[PDB]
């Protein structure tokens, strides 16, 4: 759960 | 140009609820990641949410948790901040800004790259 | 929560100066750390991504430096649109911003 993952 | 405007800004009572939106444009909204940000008078730049370009995932800053949503509709290039709960201390310019996009996928972790110029929230009796 | 200290907090140049603006944070972000420029009344924009990588439209008189705890953004010879606030923001968890480095005209 990682919200710096990539989000495109 | 990747274009980024803000709209719904306005006057709120306390506690009361307010939607904002960011119109898109210049690039594919439905494959970028998107962020709110804000900066409220005599405080620094505070992130606020994010929102994974599908809109699966979404994410909160503690002083928003609970009390703000985040959406979107790739089919309208539209990205959407439901506030609810409004405090005085949440009177600020919010931007809408998109996630780094990098093509080539390069780096373990991202950031931000373009802002929208902002629109600004009054909360006050 | 990582918090990010800038220093100094206002700088004042002239034209031509070299000038060295310092960002450090609370705990080891890696390389993830970016700077924006933001002048007054209008939306910030990315200078320097990966802490030292120049983004395209940027010209050459910026550069970035570091990684762990410790980055430098440097102007090498400043110039008139130079003159604005300066953010640097970590990357690693979540998204913070060091409080801004304003470098304003010196006369």
């Known amino acids: 759960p990682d919200p710096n993952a990539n989000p495109n | 140009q990747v274009q980024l405007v803000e709209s719904g800004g306005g006057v709120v009572q306390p506690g009361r609820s307010l939607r904002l939106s960011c119109a898109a444009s210049?690039?594919?909204?439905?494959?970028?990641?998107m962020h709110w940000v804000r900066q409220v008078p005599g405080k620094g730049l505070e992130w606020v949410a994010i929102?994974?370009?599908?809109?699966?995932?979404?994410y909160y800053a503690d002083s928003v948790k609970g009390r703000f949503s985040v959406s979107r509709d790739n089919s309208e290039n539209t990205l959407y901040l439901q506030m609810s709960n409004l405090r005085a201390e949440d009177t600020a310019v919010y931007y809408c800004?998109?996630?780094?996009?990098?093509?080539?996928?390069?780096?373990?972790?991202?950031?931000?790259?373009?802002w929208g110029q902002g629109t600004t929230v009054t909360v006050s009796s | 929560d990582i918090q990010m200290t800038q220093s100094p907090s206002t700088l004042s140049a002239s034209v031509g100066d070299r000038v060295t603006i310092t960002c450090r944070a609370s705990?080891?972000?890696?390389?993830?750390l970016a700077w924006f420029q933001k002048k007054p009344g209008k939306a910030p924009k990315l200078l320097i991504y990966?802490?030292?990588n120049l983004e395209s439209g940027v010209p050459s008189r910026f550069s970035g430096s570091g990684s762990g705890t410790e980055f430098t953004l440097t102007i090498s010879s400043l110039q008139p649109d130079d003159f604005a606030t300066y953010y640097c923001?970590?990357?690693?968890?979540?998204?913070?911003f060091g409080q801004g480095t304003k470098v304003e005209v010196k006369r």
């Open positions: 800004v998109r996630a780094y996009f990098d093509s080539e996928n390069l780096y373990d972790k991202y950031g931000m790259d373009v």
């Open positions: 210049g690039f594919t909204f439905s494959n970028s990641g």
């Open positions: 929102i994974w370009y599908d809109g699966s995932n979404k």
């Open positions: 705990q080891s972000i890696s390389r993830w």
């Open positions: 990966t802490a030292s």
């Open positions: 923001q970590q990357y690693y968890n979540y998204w913070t």
